[PDB]
Coordinates of C-alpha atoms and ligand atoms in Angstrom, one line a residue:
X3 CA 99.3 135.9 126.1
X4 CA 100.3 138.7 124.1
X5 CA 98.9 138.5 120.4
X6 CA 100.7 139.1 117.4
X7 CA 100.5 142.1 115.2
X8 CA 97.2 141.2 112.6
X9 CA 97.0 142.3 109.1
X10 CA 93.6 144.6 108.3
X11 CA 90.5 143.3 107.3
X12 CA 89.3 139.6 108.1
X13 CA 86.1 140.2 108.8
X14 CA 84.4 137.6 107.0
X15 CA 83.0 134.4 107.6
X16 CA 86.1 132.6 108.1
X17 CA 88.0 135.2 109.0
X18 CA 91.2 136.4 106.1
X19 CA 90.6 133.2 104.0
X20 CA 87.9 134.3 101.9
X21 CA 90.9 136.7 101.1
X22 CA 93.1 134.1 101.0
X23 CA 90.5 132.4 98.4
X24 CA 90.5 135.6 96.2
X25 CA 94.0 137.3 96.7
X26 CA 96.2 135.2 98.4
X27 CA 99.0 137.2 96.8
X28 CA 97.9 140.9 97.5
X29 CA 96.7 139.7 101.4
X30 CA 100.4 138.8 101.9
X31 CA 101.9 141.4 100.6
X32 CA 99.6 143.3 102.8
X33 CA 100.8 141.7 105.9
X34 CA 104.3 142.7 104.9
X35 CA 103.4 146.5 104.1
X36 CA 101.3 147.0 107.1
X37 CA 103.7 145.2 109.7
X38 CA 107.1 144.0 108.5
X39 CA 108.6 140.9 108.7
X40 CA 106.4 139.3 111.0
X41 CA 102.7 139.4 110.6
X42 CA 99.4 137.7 110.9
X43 CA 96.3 137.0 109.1
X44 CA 93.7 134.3 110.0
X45 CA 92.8 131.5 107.9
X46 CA 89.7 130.5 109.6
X47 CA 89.9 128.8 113.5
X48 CA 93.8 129.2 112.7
X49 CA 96.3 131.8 112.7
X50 CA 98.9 132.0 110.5
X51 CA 102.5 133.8 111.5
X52 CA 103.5 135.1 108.4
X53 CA 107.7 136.2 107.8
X54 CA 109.3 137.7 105.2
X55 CA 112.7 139.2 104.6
X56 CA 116.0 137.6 104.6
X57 CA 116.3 137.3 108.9
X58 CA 112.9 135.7 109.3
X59 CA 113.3 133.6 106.7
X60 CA 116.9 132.3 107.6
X61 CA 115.0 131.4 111.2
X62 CA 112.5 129.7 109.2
X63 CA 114.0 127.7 106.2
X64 CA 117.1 126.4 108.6
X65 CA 114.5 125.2 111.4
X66 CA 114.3 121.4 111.5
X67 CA 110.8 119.3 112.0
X68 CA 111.9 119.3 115.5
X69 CA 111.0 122.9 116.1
X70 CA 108.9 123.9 112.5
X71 CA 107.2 120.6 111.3
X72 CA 106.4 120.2 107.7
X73 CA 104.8 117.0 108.1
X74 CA 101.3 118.1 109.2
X75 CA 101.4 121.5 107.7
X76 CA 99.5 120.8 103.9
X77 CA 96.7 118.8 105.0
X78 CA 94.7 119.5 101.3
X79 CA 97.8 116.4 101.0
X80 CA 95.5 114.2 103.5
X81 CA 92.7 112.9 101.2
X82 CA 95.5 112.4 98.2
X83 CA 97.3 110.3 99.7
X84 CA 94.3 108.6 100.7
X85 CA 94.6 105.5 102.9
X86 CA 96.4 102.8 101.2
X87 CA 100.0 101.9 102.1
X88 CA 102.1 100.3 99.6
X89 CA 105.6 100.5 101.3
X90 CA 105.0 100.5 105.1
X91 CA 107.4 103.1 106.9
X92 CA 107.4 106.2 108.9
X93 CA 106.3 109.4 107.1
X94 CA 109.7 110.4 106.3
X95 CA 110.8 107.5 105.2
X96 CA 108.0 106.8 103.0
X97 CA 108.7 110.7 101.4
X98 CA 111.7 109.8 100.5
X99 CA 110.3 106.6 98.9
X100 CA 107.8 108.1 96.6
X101 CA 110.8 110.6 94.6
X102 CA 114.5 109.2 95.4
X103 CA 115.1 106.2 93.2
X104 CA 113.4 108.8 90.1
X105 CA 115.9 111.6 91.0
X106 CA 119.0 109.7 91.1
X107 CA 121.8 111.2 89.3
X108 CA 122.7 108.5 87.2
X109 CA 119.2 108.3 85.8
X110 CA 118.7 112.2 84.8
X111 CA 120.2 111.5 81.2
X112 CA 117.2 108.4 80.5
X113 CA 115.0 110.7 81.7
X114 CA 115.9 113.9 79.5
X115 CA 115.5 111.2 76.5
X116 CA 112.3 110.3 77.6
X117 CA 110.6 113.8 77.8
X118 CA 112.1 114.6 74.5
X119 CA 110.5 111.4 73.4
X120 CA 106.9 112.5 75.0
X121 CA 107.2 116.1 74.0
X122 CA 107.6 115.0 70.1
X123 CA 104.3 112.8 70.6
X124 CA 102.6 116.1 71.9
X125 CA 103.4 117.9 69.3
X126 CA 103.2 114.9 66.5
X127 CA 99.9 116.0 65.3
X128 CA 100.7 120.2 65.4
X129 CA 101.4 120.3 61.3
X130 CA 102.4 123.7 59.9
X131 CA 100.7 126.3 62.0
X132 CA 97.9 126.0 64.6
X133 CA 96.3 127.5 68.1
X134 CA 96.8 125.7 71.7
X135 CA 95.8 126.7 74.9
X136 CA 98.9 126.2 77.2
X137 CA 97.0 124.7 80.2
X138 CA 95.7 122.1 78.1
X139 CA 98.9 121.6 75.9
X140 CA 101.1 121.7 79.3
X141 CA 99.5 119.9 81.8
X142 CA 98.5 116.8 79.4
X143 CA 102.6 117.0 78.7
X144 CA 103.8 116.9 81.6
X145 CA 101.4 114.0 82.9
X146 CA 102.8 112.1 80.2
X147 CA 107.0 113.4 81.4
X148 CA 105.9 112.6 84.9
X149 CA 104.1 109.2 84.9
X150 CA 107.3 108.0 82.3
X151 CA 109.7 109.1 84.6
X152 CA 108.5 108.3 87.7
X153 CA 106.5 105.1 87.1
X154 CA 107.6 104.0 83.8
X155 CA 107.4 104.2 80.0
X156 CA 105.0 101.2 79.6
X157 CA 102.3 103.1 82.4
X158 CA 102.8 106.2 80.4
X159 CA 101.6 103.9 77.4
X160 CA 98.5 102.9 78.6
X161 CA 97.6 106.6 79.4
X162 CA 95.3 108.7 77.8
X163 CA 94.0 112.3 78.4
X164 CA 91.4 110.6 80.5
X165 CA 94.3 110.7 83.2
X166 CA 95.0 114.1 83.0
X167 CA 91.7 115.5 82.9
X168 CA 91.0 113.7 86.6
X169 CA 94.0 114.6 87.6
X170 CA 93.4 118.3 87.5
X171 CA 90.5 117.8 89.5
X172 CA 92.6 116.2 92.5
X173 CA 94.2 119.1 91.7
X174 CA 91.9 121.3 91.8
X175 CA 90.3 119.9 95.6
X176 CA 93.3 121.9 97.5
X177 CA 91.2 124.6 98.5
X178 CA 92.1 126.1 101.7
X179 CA 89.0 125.5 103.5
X180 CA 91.3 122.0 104.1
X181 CA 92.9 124.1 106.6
X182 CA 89.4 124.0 108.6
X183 CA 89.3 120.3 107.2
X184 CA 89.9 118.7 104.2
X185 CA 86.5 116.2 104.3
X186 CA 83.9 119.3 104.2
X187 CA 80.8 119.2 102.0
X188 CA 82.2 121.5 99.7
X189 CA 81.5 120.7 95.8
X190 CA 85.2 120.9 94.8
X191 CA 86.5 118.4 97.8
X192 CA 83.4 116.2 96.2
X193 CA 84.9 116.7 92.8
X194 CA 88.4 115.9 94.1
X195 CA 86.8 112.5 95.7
X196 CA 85.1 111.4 92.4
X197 CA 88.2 112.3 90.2
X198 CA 90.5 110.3 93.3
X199 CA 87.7 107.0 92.0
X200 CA 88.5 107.9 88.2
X201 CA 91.9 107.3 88.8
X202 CA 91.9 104.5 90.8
X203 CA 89.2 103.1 88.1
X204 CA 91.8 103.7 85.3
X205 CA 94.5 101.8 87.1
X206 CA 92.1 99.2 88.1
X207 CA 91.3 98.6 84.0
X208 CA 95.1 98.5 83.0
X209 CA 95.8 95.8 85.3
X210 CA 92.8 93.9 84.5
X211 CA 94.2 94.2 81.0
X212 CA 97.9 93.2 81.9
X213 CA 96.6 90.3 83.3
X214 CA 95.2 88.8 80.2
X215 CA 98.6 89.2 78.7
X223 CA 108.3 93.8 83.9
X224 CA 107.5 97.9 85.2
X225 CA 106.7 98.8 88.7
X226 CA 102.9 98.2 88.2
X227 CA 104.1 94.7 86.7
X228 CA 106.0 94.4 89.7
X229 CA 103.6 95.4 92.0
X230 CA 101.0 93.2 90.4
X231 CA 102.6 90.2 91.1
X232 CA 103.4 90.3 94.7
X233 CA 101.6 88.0 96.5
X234 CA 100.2 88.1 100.4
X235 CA 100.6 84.4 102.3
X236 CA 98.1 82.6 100.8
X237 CA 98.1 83.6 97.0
X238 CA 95.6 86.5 96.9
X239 CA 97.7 89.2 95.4
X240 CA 98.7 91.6 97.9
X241 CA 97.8 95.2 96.5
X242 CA 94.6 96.9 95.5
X243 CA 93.9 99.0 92.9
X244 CA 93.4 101.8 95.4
X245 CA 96.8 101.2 97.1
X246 CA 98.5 101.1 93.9
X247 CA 96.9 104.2 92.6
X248 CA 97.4 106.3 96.4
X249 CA 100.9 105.8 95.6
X250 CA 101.3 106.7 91.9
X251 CA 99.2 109.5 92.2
X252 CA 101.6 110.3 95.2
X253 CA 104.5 109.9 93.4
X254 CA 103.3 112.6 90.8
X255 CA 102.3 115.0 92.5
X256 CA 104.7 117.5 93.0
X257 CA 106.0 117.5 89.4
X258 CA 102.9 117.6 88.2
X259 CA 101.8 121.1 88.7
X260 CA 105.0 123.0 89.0
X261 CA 106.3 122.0 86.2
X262 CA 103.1 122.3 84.0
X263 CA 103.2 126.1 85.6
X264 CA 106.9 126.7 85.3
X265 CA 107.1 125.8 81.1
X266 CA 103.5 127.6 80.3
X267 CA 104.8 130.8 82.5
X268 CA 108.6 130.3 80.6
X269 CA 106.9 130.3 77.3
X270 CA 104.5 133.4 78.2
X271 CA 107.5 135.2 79.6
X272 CA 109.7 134.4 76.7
X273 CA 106.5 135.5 74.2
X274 CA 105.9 138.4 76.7
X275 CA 109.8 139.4 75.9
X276 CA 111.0 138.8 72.6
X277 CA 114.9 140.1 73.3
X278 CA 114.8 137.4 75.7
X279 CA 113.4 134.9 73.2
X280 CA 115.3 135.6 70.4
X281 CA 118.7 134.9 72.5
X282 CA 117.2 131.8 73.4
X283 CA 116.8 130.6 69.9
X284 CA 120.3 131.6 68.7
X285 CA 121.8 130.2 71.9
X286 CA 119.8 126.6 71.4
X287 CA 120.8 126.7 67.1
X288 CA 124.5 127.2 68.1
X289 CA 124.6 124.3 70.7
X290 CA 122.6 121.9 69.2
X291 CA 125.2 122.6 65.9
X292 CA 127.3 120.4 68.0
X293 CA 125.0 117.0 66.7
X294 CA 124.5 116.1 70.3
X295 CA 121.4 114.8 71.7
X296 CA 118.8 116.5 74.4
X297 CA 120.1 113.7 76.8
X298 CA 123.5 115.5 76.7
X299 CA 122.4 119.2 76.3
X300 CA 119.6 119.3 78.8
X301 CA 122.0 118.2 81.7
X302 CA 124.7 120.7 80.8
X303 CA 124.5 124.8 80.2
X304 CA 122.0 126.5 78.4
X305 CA 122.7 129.8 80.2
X306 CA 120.0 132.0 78.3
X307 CA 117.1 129.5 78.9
X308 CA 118.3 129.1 82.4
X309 CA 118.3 132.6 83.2
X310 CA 114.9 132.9 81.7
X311 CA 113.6 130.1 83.7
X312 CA 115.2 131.9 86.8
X313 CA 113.6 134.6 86.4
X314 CA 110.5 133.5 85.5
X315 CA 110.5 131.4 88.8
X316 CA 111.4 134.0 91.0
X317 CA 108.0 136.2 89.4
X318 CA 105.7 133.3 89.2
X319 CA 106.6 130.7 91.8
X320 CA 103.9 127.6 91.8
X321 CA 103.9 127.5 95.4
X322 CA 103.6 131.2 96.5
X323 CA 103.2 129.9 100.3
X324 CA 105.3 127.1 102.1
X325 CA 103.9 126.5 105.8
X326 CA 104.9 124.7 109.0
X327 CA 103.6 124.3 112.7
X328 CA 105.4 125.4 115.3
X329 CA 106.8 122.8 117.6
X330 CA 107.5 125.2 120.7
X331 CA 107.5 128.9 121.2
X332 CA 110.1 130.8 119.2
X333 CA 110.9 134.5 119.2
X334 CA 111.5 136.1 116.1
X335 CA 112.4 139.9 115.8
X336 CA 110.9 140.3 119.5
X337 CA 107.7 138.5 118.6
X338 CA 106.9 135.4 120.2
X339 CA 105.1 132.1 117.9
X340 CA 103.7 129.6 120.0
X341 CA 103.3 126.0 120.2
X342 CA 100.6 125.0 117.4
X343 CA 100.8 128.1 115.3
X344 CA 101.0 128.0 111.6
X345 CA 104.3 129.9 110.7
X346 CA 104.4 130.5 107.1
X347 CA 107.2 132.3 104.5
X348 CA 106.4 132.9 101.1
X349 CA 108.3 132.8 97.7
X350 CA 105.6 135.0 96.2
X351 CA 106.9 138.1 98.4
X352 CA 110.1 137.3 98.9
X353 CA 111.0 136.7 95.5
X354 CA 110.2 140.5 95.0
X355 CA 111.5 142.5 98.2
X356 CA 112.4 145.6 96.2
X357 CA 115.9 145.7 98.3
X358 CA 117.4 142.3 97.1
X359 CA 115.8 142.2 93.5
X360 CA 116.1 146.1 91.9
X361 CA 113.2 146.6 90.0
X362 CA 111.3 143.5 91.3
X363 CA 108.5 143.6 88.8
X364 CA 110.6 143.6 86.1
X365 CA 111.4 140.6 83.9
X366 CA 115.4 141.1 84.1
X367 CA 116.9 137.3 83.6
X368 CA 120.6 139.3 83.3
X369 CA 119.9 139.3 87.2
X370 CA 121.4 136.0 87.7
X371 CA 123.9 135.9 84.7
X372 CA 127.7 135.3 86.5
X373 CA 128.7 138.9 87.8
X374 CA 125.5 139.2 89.0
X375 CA 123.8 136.0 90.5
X376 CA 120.9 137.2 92.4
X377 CA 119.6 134.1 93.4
X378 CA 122.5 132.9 94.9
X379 CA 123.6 136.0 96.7
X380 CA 119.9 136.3 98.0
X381 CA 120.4 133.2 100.1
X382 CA 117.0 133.4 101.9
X383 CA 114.5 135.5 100.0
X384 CA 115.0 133.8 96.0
X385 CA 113.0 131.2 97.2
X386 CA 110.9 129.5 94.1
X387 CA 112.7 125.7 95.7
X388 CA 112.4 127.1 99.4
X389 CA 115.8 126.7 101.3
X390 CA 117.3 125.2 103.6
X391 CA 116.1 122.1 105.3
X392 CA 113.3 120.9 103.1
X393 CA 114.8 122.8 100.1
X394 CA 113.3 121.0 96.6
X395 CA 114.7 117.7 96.1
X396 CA 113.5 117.9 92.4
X397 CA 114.8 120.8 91.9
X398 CA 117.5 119.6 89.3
X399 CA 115.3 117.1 87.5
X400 CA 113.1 120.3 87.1
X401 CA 115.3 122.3 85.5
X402 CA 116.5 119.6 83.0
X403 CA 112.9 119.2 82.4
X404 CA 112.3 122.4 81.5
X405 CA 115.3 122.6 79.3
X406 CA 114.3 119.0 77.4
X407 CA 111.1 120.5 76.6
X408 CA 111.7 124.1 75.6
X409 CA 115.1 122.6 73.4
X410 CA 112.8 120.7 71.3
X411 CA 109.8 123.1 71.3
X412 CA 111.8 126.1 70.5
X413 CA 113.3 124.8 67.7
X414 CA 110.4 122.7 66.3
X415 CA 107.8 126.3 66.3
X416 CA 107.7 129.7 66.7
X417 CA 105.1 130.9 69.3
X418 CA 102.8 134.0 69.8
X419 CA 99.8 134.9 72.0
X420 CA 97.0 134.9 70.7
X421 CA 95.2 137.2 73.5
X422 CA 96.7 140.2 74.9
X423 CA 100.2 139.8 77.1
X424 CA 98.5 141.2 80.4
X425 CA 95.7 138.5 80.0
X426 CA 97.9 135.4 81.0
X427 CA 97.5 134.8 84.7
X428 CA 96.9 132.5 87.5
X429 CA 94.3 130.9 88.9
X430 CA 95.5 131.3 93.1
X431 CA 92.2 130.3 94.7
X432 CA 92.9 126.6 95.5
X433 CA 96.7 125.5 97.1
X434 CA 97.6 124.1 93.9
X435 CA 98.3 127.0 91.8
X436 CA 97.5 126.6 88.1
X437 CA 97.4 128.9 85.1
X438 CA 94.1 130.9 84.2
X439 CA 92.1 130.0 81.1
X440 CA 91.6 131.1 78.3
X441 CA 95.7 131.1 77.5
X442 CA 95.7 131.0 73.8
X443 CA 98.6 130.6 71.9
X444 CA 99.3 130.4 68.4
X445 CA 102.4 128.2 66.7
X446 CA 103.8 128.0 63.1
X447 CA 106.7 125.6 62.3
X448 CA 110.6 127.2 61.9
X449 CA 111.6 127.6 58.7
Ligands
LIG1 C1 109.8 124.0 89.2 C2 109.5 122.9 89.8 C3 109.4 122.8 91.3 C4 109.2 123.8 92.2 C5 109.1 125.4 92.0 C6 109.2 123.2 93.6 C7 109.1 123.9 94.7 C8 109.4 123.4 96.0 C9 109.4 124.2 97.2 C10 109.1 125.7 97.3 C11 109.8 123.3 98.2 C12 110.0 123.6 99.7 C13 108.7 123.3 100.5 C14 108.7 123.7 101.9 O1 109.7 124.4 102.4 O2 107.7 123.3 102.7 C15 110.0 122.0 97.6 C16 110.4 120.9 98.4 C17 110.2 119.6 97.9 N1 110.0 119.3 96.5 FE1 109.7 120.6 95.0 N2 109.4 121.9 93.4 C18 109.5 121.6 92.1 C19 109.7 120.3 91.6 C20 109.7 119.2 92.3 C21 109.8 117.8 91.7 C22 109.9 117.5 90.2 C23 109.7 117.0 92.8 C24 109.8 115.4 92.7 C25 110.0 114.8 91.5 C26 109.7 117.7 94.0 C27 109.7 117.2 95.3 C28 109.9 117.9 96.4 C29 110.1 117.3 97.7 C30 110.1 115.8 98.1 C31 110.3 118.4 98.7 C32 110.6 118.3 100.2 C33 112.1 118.2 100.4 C34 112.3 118.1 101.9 O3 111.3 118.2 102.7 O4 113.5 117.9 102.3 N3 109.7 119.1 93.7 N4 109.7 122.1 96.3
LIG2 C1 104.4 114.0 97.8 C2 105.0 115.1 98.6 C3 105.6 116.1 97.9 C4 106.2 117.2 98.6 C5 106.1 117.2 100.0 S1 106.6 118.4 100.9 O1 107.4 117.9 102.0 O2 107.4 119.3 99.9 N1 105.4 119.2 101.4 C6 104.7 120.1 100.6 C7 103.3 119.4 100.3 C8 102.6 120.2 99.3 O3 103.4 120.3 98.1 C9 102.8 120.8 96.9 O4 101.6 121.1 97.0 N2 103.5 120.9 95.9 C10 104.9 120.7 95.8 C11 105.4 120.7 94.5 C12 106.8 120.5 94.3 N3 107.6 120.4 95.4 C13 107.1 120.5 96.6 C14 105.7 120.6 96.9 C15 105.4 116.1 100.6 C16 104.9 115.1 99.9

């Protein structure tokens, strides 16, 4: 019956998520100035318990789906998966379906090979010296590293920019109005829905194709219900690749155009990069070996750049039961919510928080590790990032053969890189103009 300390403002229409809309970032940090480390703001009919700090946190990233359930707590998820149901399980089980055969261990080193592989075709056509915008450079990329890793080299084939260009439209239908409900007649939820029939088109045409002349869309192709009708639509099949790519789509399109910004932005920092990659790669060994082994400069940089830009700047839950945190009681159906984009700057674990420092996590130092609970671009605890590592060798495939391919410099002014934060996917601003000349 008692209500929860509420951050200022909120008077709009819906409450704080025109805010939310606008300054998702500087409303947060807001609820953590004005009221500590448990807060609230409201995002239209709901409220949302916000904690920061290493305490709340803890109580947060260690809770199970038992008490803080992750299942129902992204709903902009609802109209990407769509309906369809290739693999029929329970929620859970079907999670792990869509990433864990991809992010297997023994298939990281195939996978490093590949991205090298699509990363020269992006660049094939670059010549001596040119202009890219890193959006556009990235986020075509790493549709191409995703759909070959996760689906298959053959799929990747049949791809086209087409695919990525609807793609950042599903993307782009996340606003957080789809905490109201994700079906309202909004004009970006309509875009998302057209670009969800694009996709689903595109798939539809390669199979037509394939069937006029083994991966898993070959697979899937040929399974047959009882009486010979094949079993799976183009809109199942689709639901479930564009499931599949989901959450390595936009972080890592983020995480290498924010690496290469920082690393432009910081050209100590770059430099030691380049010497580090020149010396390793004297050894004559593939990207297949290097980018699952140390690169401790790059890593550090990557670090770093993850704890000041991390793509999801809020992870959420709903509460389960009533919970007391730090005297202040979250009931049964509230959104409780921690965010990296704080935490991962809480001037008392990380000196100098706005500071690009990646010697914060070199080995007598290791910030992210001591700070257990509050370096949090991967979350922690229960539902910690399972891609986590494919990630990070991602990052380190693409950058070991950019890097050392071109030299890059912005073209626009350092301070004029930044994100777009209005939708729950959070992708980089345009213009981001880069220019690139080959090493000599
Ligand atoms: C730099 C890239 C990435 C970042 C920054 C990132 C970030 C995160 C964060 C913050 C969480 C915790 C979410 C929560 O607590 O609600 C998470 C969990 C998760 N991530 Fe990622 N992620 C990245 C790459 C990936 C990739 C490549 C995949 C799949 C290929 C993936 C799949 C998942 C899954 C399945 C979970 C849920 C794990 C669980 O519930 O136990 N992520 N990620
Ligand atoms: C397909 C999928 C992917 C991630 C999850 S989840 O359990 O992490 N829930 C968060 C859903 C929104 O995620 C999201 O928007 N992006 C994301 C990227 C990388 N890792 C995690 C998340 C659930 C389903």
């Amino acid at each position: 019956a008692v209500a929860l300390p509420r951050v200022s403002g909120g008077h709009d229409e819906h409450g704080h998520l025109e805010e939310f809309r606008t300054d998702p970032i500087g409303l947060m940090q807001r609820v953590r100035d004005e009221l500590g480390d448990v807060g609230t703001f409201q995002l239209a009919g709901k409220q949302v318990v916000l904690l920061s700090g290493s305490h709340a946190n803890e109580f947060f990233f260690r809770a199970g789906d038992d008490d803080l359930d992750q299942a129902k707590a992204y709903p902009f998820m609802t109209p990407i998966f769509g309906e369809g149901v290739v693999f029929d399980a329970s929620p859970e089980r079907r999670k792990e379906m869509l990433h864990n055969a991809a992010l297997r261990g023994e298939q990281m080193k195939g996978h490093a090979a590949t991205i090298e592989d699509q990363v020269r075709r992006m660049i094939a056509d670059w010549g001596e010296a040119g202009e890219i915008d890193l959006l556009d450079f990235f986020a075509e990329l790493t549709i191409y590293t995703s759909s070959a890793c996760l689906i298959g080299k053959k799929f990747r084939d049949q791809l086209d920019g087409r695919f990525a260009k609807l793609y950042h439209e599903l993307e782009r239908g996340t606003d957080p109005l789809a905490y109201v409900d994700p079906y309202l007649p909004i004009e970006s939820f309509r875009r998302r829905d057209e670009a969800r029939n694009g996709l689903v088109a595109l798939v539809a045409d390669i199979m037509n194709g394939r069937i006029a002349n083994r991966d898993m869309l070959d697979v899937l192709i040929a399974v047959k219900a009882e009486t010979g009708t094949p079993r799976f639509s183009a809109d199942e099949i689709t639901g479930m690749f564009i499931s599949m790519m989901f959450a390595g789509h936009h972080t890592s399109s983020g995480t290498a155009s924010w690496t290469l910004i920082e690393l432009m932005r910081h050209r100590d920092a770059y430099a030691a990069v380049i010497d580090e990659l020149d010396e390793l790669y004297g050894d004559g060994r593939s990207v297949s070996f290097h980018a699952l082994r140390q690169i401790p400069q790059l890593e550090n940089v990557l670090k770093e750049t993850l704890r000041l830009h991390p793509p999801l700047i809020i992870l959420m839950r709903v509460a389960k039961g009533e919970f007391e945190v730090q005297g202040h009681r979250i009931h049964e159906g509230d959104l409780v919510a921690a965010s990296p984009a704080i935490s991962n700057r809480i001037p008392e674990d990380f000196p100098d928080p706005h500071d690009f420092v990646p010697a914060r996590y070199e080995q007598p130092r290791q910030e992210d590790l001591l700070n257990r609970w509050t370096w949090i671009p991967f979350g922690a605890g229960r539902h910690r990032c399972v891609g986590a590592a494919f990630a990070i060798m991602q990052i380190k495939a693409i950058f070991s053969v950019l890097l050392r391919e071109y030299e890059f410099e912005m073209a626009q002014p350092p301070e004029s890189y930044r994100n777009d934060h209005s939708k729950m996917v959070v992708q980089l601003a345009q213009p981001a103009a880069v220019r690139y000349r080959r090493r000599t």
